[PDB]
Amino acid sequence: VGLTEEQKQEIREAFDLFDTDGSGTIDAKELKVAMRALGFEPKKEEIKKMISEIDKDGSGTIDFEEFLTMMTAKMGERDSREEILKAFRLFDDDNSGTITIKDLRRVAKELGENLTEEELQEMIAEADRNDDNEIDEDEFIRIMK
């Protein structure tokens, strides 16, 4: 639940890696060279905005503590995701990848509840948002969170 020691040290080493001059702080130029090596190919305007969000003391640079606070909150997010998705997969009855009207018919049975096909499609359409009559991982995560 809280950062592991192993994660604390990984974040440090990732910090020291991004900090190429050893300044103690990640500047806007180091952030973009790090975001590319992370695959990314970001735009100046985004880098700036990253900087402004992670920075807390107006330096326009990221020190270790600002980086740690950010990484802490990302990993936190990533683990709440992985946990909502353990449940998703309970509701993905046939392990298809998305919760469909078939999955909910079956769930409904397995709870001894007699809900109509119409009663169930409403559900889908509330949580649905790309108009495919399915509930995918992001839709589920969303209607939980």
């Binding site: 946990e83 909502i84 353990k86 449940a87 309970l90 709870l111 509840e113 809900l115 009663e119 409403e122």
Partner: peptide, 20 residues
């Protein structure tokens, strides 16, 4: 486990008994 239990035990019957 706390997530999931709280969905089933409370969240699901509430939602069900609504559509009813």
């Amino acid at each position: 486990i706390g997530a999931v239990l709280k969905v089933l035990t409370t969240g699901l019957p509430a939602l069900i008994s609504w559509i009813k």
